[PDB]
Design a protein around this ligand. Structure first.
Ligand SMILES: NC(=O)c1ccc[n+]([C@@H]2O[C@H](COP(=O)([O-])OP(=O)(O)OC[C@H]3O[C@@H](n4cnc5c(N)ncnc54)[C@H](O)[C@@H]3O)[C@@H](O)[C@H]2O)c1
Ligand SMILES: NC(=O)c1ccc[n+]([C@@H]2O[C@H](COP(=O)([O-])OP(=O)(O)OC[C@H]3O[C@@H](n4cnc5c(N)ncnc54)[C@H](O)[C@@H]3O)[C@@H](O)[C@H]2O)c1
Lengths: 309, 315
């Protein structure tokens, strides 16, 4: 059975039914400290910073695999680093130990471009590169990638991870995250309202659409245990763009749309990250691939965001 | 007022007296969960995994600086990673938060070449490079560097760190660690006994002599803030050699001594580390320098170890 922690997040919201559709409705169990509609799929409240709660859940549902999504993101982490550290650091440690302790075949941890810092090359950055994160979030994530690879090499625990860039999606509502401007913008656009962007006009960052984000995670998860070499830290991306670019492209569809720039601390966060990633390793080892280019995600988002507003 | 954490270790047993001679026994507080003779300097029992204990020591002694040495090393860390994670990771976070919450001006953390991994270049590795450690010890240490750099950037807490290579010394004795063979070999050499080395004969590693290791840590502590651009993660070294090489050089002084190689898990650890480091950033940003080259250290070690084992009466 599959346990998904932090199932109520941007990813978890869609990953759950995605998994249910592919593996069976009662072979998946959603969990978080905040509950949301799981379309019938079994849900349980689980605090990842409490080792006891994790063990008991693994016990009762005979957990076979774990998609560990619980954690605090970059923006919220800078507003409350003590919290980011507690849930991210203590949290992923607890799950690793709980997984190693019991009979857990696999554990997938989504990593982030946040593991990068200002010394990291800005373009075509490969998976093996400099990793000196400047945010509490990025520190806890690089720690996660290393802890996972260590548990694998040391105890054989099959933990894998890929680094997601900014993710565009419509099912889950934005949460003021560093890269969330790429989602908030569509909401203002469909309402033909002026949007106040918090990242610089030319703040280039790698991004991808949720559909490809989901497939990438499951493909990583379905990869043969003995065919993965990098295993942890796979750079994954679909395209790179600036807020200014996304704006103009959306304007081509909704010309009335207006935008203004009022950057804050989140732009300082984004400035420490690379603009584009090289994902050859993910494609070479487990065939990672994108089927939604920018044009396709823009139209798709407008379509979905308008229909639900 | 300086508080040294993990004072009973290789670095600690010699750093305390060093610090005391530089700033006065009265301005130095040694601490550890294991007490050892400190020679006059005040010693207190302090478990860094207990945030409360740290706050109390900092409060009572009005601590202005912390040399945070407490931790579980590479070898011991692999036999008990859970213990390593708890002491090194949460112990370092505890120190940083406690330093920040209180009024500690500086915190100095000794890191290690252990932060590097297979993907790290093997020769003349610069400070900013690939860091994919393959030991629990190394992961907790790179995390410490990052947490330390974060505490500065986020809260303005003045935290600095350098990465030590293998440290050779005659006062503190090896503790079945990874680079301890470089000290152990001298005890066997002086006694004209066959030394069983646990690292492969061609296992090249960066090393340095204790006196230079101590001076480097204190030089970083006193460094001008204006020049500290890297701040955390300064590579530091003196020389690089393989066990067979150190053996031969020692043999030049004591020919009636030999060695055999029976590698264990520690050689597997060493194999994921680089052979030599580039310590330019440290020299440029805060003046790091070496006083003991390989020959001077071999000869000084033979000297001290010989009298330590009573081969040549203390006079
Ligand atoms: N947001 C991104 O752009 C991004 C990109 C790459 C990787 N990631 C990683 O993916 C994971 C989640 O991503 P997301 O986009 O769904 O973020 P999200 O903010 O949408 O969801 C995170 C979830 O963590 C939950 N959570 C917080 N504390 C918890 C606890 N103690 N126990 C259980 N759940 C807890 C939250 O309630 C939330 O549902 C994180 O671990 C993050 O590091 C995020
Ligand atoms: N030994 C080396 O060659 C070397 C090289 C580079 C960096 N370092 C770093 O220097 C520090 C100490 O080095 P060392 O050579 O003196 O190692 P050591 O093994 O000689 O000493 C480590 C000390 O940590 C203490 N300790 C363990 N848990 C503790 C706790 N919970 N609270 C307080 N103390 C605790 C031990 O009792 C011991 O005295 C470590 O942080 C290590 O990562 C060591």
């Amino acid at each position: 059975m599959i346990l998904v922690t932090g199932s109520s997040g941007q990813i978890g919201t869609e990953l759950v039914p995605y998994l249910a559709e592919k593996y069976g409705k009662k072979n998946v169990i959603a969990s978080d400290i905040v509950q949301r509609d799981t379309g019938g799929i079994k849900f349980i409240t689980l605090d990842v910073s409490n080792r006891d709660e994790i063990d008991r859940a693994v016990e009762k549902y005979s957990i076979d695999a774990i998609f560990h999504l619980a954690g605090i993101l970059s923006a919220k982490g800078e507003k409350d680093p003590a919290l980011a550290y507690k849930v991210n650091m203590n949290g992923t440690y607890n799950i690793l130990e709980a997984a190693k302790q019991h009979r857990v075949e696999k554990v997938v941890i989504p990593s982030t471009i946040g593991v990068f810092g200002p010394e990291t090359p800005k373009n075509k950055v490969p998976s093996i590169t400099i990793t000196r994160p400047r945010t509490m979030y990025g520190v806890t994530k690089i720690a996660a990638e290393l802890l996972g690879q260590y548990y694998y090499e040391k105890f054989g625990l099959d933990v894998r991870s890929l680094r997601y860039p900014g993710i565009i999606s419509y099912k889950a509502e934005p949460t003021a995250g560093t890269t969330d401007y790429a989602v908030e913008i569509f909401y203002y656009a469909v309402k033909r309202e002026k949007y106040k962007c918090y990242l610089a006009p030319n703040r280039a960052l790698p991004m991808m659409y949720m559909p490809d984000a989901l497939k990438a995670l499951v493909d990583l998860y379905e990869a043969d245990r003995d065919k993965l070499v990098l295993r942890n830290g796979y750079n994954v991306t679909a395209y790179t763009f600036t807020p200014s670019e996304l704006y103009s492209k959306i304007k081509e569809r909704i010309p009335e749309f207006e935008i203004e720039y009022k950057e804050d601390f989140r732009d300082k966060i984004a400035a420490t990250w690379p603009e584009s990633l090289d994902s050859s390793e993910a494609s070479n080892e487990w065939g990672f691939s994108i089927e939604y280019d920018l044009d396709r995600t823009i139209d798709d988002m407008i379509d979905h965001i308008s229909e639900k507003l």
